[PDB]
Design a protein around this nucleic acid. Structure first.
Lengths: 46, 271
RNA sequence: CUUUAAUGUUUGAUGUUCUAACGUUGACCCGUAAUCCGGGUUGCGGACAGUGUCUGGUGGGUAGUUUGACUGGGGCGGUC
RNA sequence: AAUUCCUUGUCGGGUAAGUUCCGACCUGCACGAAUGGCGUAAUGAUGGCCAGGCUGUCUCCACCCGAGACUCAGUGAAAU
RNA sequence: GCUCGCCGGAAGACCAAGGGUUCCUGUCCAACGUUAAUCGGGGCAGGGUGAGUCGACCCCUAAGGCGAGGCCGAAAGGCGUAGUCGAUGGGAAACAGGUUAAUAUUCCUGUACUUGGUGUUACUGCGAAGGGGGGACGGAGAAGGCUAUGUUGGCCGGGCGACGGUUGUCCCGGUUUAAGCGUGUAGGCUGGUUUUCCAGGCAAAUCCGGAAAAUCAAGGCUGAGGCGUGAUGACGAGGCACUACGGUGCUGAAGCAACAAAUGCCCUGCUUCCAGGAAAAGCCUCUAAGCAUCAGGUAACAUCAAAUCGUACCCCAAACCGACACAGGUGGUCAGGUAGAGAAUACCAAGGCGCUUGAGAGAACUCGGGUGAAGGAACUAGGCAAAAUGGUGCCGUAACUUCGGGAGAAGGCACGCUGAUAUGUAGGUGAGGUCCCUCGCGGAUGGAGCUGAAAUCAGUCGAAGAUACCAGCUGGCUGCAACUGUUUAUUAAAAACACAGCACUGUGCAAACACGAAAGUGGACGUAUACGGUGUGACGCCUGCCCGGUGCCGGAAGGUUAAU
RNA sequence: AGGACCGAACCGACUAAUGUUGAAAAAUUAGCGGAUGACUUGUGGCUGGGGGUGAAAGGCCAAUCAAACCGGGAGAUAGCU
RNA sequence: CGCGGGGUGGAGCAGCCUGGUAGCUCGUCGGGCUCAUAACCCGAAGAUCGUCGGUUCAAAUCCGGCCCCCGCAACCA
RNA sequence: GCUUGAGUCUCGUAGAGGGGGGUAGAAUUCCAGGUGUAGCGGUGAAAUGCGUAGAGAUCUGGAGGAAUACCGGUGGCGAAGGCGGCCCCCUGGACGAAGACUGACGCUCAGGUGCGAAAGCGUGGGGAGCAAACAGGAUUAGAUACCCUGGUAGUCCACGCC
């Protein structure tokens, strides 16, 4: 049948995009953690 | 007027259309027309607030005139427009000065009729004058609670308030629900009952009639499960509770009157 | 003391009247090219209404919980 | 009876034969009037039942054509 | 290479989304490829994506987001005004041809077009976030005109033939041409032109609206398609020349007519229904502030500029999403021939393709099919499955009914091919000629040619003429639900849920009720013929008794009664 | 005209067989219902965990839903294996 | 079978849970009323408590056994 | 051809004739309020009912709906059903006078068509009084009734059936 993942770059960035993470303190705190963890991909972008 | 529809398909069998040939069949006068977006019964949070309502066919908001602030100016009526947003049909008035304004159409109105506002105008239906000058007992509509408010009472089609008595700035009204209520004499009111009294004789007919009227289907309490509503459960349509609204407030005979501050205006209450 | 008159006074209730607190999802004006908001001039109510602290009722709308054991399987029944 | 326990109630209809079906009787274990009563044309990938047509569903299977199974070569899993 | 088979409203050809080099060319077979593999969407190297006109960006905005101040909140923060983002919608402009191992409406050859800037010249009141017009919108239906496109003939070129005939009414192929510029047609809409006046469009307005007159009755807008030009050009069947021998260079015939005909276009039109059907900017216009010698605007001419990013390839799949080169999934555009009502189906063209293991054998048994004596539901929980019915025209058609139905009821009949009516008709199309005209894309008359059903009759073949694919099983009694619908994705499609209708009940507007500890939203820019909730569920005939228990509403005398 | 009739695209998912370490973590083949609407679909938005949404099955909320997933409390607690 | 509720003049009900001598309505009998019967008025009678045994000085009552009537339970795979 | 039937015209007369729209007063009911105190109401007799929460009586004010006293009559008008306050508007028919005019155009009428009390039925209003159904109370052998206290459709209005 039709599967659960149906990519749309536009929709992908509106939600998990960098600037959408900069939105609220909850998001920025995500970035704080991911840097702290030393993770390569800070957030999804390319 | 009322036209019962020949059976041809089920759901057509029971339909009774209300035809009004006298109503204008062309497009609305454009200047007065803003868009009206569908709330779908949802607020700012986005949560649904009122169930039943949503969907429906698109419609635009006619800016109807209520305050009737233009005074002493003759106004010739032009055509009776259909208004999707309300029940009553709205007349497209044309003043001598050149401005056009929509207004709720009184019963006895025809195209080309002369009507006027102001403290003088006259007793001919459709004229709006401050209630202090209206004779005791006569019928009026589009009554204002406060001057300049625009209009509140008796706007739905076929509805009319009946003045009963006057004392001081106050003037008693017999509302359409039968509830007596005082109001300020300075308030304006339009003579004559509102038109399209046969609106209630419309019997829509098929289920779809309601859908595009903008009302979505209703699910009854008993059908739902305990968790979704105070009623529910049972293996065999069991009930055994006192009827309540979904949020637990008692229904079926429970008074909900609360304001307290407005009680001085109310005299009799509905029975 | 008894049965009770009036004045003054302590406050208490009820009602009427007034407005200066307060309300105004009434009108008009200004910031202002802004049906937000503020300020003002009004009118409308008006010491109510509404809010705080205390307090009686209601309260499965919501939450936390209890709902025994024996027992010729267990529930029922009986028993402690 | 989508309710009827005793029950395959009793009578009649339909079948050579009918615990089902249809129509009746009323002792309604324990129907019943908007948690609706009783009728109802049309509608139904709806429940029950009887006919006509149709046939390998069956009496009783028979043969045939294709894809696997089978042998040779290459590759080469699994639960346990 | 030859042959054979399959799709052909796709298993073809373009895109979007999404991938991110998989495209092409050389080289390699380690692994990957379900086998081998010289091959490859694998490895390795090199190469390849050209735009003023396509698209994005950009101008504008919907729902919706963010939100200076602001109101609100233990804090984080919530809501939201001005504003500012946000296409899936609106906004300026290009086509045909040729070309590459791979790109093209981007390169080249032609022929265009648009928006600006700047300057020159001639005329001139310009100027707004303000005013107004416009932009700007539903569904359904019906018809007429058209075109794509095809068919047939004509024309041109080729052929005259492996085994009977075949220079003839014979066979085979080709017969294409754009945008723009000109012309303004079918056809649709609309009464125009002038003067004067104004309680209006927040101020003004020569605009808009409105009211008077005068005056002529046509004027204007809209517009497919055709016709010219563009185009004495290109393309072109094929020949002529060599061929890294794969192909490249050289030359070039005809290039019309009629007929049929779209779901495309005129048509966001017309008619009609109610369920009554986006904003905003570009654009046109009106002036205010402001500036009048200006500045600025209008027209013409010239000249410059038009940036930046995407552009390969796949794209109903082997490259996207399903752990895989997986029988799954995914939106848009084009849509040829014969038969057919048809985008169904059968066979084909264009164009791809034979599904990455094969080769034998021809047991049981399993899968998918074909057929069957006689009987015909005896099978079985049950006709489950199969079988059968199946098309068009005509005849004919019951109980019941809400008078529409039921009803394609049931049940029958006819149907091929040839000829004649008619050396192809009824129709449709409409030439030539002729006539008329306030003359052209005009109208009448006229019938050439073309196309062309259906019917009757006569004959004739086969067992069978709706011969294939395609293509209703029907009838009777009865339960339940009125009906179309919806539902447990991934075992339940129902008698459940909805439903129109019905009743009760709440709500007088700062409404009830809901979301938010609040501001505030929805309710609703609605107002008791409205809105909330609860129950029943079309329609017909109806809805009987009980207010003791419980709940709600109403009454406050008396009793009891918290904080204070 | 119509929540009209027959029936393709399209949407649904009624019956049977195959398949049940599948071709596939629900499909295929033959039939099946709707098919101008309470239709269907693209794109983009909005609603959130005792919350959403629900023509209501306690269905659906990223293959899980009588209370999602992820991290922390947390080495919870287990008279039980 | 497990339990609960009862059994009372001719019929239906009390009475009994607190053991000291069984009441109500109707029916019956008789006498009046009426031409006669019904209705009506007056009076009287009738059971000495399902039943077999305990208990206590005394049992309708309390207890146990038995015979009938009534209702509930009689289940889970 | 005739005017003696039938009809038309000319000016009048009376009428609860019909339809539509307004309007008045008395009374019943209810609601607010004032005074006021223990019964009221009802019956053959009672009770049910209402009332120390202040009834009924009484007074002022308001709100409603219905029907229209007396006049009113072995009176009137209408085809029949039927029609009663006052007033407006639209409108039918009858009767009389004096003539004038038309010139048998007449009479009856199957089928047809129209109207047609009350009740009843539909849709939507309104709802005072009365009142089927229903409740209670009595009365009775019983009383599903007569009688009493309440009371719903209905009675009323508009249209449509019957």
């Amino acid at each position: 049948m039709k599967r659960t993942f149906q990519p749309s770059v536009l929709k992908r960035n509106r939600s998990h995009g960098f600037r959408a993470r900069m939105a609220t303190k909850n998001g920025r705190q995500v970035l704080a953690r991911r840097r702290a963890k030393g993770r390569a991909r800070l957030t999804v972008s390319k | 007027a009322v036209v019962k529809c020949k059976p041809t398909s089920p759901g057509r069998r029971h339909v009774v259309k209300v035809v009004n040939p006298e109503l204008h069949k062309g497009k609305p006068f454009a200047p007065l027309l803003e868009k009206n977006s569908k709330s779908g019964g949802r607020n700012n949070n986005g949560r649904i607030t009122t169930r039943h309502i949503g969907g429906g066919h698109k419609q635009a908001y006619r800016i109807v005139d209520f305050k009737r602030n233009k005074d002493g100016i003759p106004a010739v009526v032009e055509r009776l427009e259909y208004d999707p947003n309300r029940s009553a049909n709205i007349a497209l008035v044309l003043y001598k000065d050149g401005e056009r304004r929509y207004i709720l159409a009184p019963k006895g109105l025809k195209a080309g009729d002369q009507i006027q506002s102001g403290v003088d105008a006259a007793i001919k239906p459709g004229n709006t004058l401050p209630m202090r000058n209206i004779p005791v007992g006569s019928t009026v509509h589009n009554v204002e609670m406060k001057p300049g408010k625009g209009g509140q009472l008796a706007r739905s089609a076929g509805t009319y308030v009946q003045i009963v008595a006057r004392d001081g700035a106050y003037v008693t009204l017999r509302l359409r629900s039968g509830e007596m209520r005082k109001v300020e004499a300075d308030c304006r009111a339009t003579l004559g009952e509102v038109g399209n009294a046969e609106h209630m004789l419309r019997v829509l007919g098929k289920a779809g009639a309601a859908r595009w009227r903008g009302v979505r289907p209703t699910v009854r309490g008993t059908a739902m499960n305990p968790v979704d509503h105070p009623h529910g459960g049972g293996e065999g349509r069991n009930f055994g509770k006192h009827p309540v609204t979904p949020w637990g407030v008692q229904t079926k005979g429970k008074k909900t009157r609360s304001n307290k501050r407005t009680d001085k205006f109310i005299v009799r209450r509905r029975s």
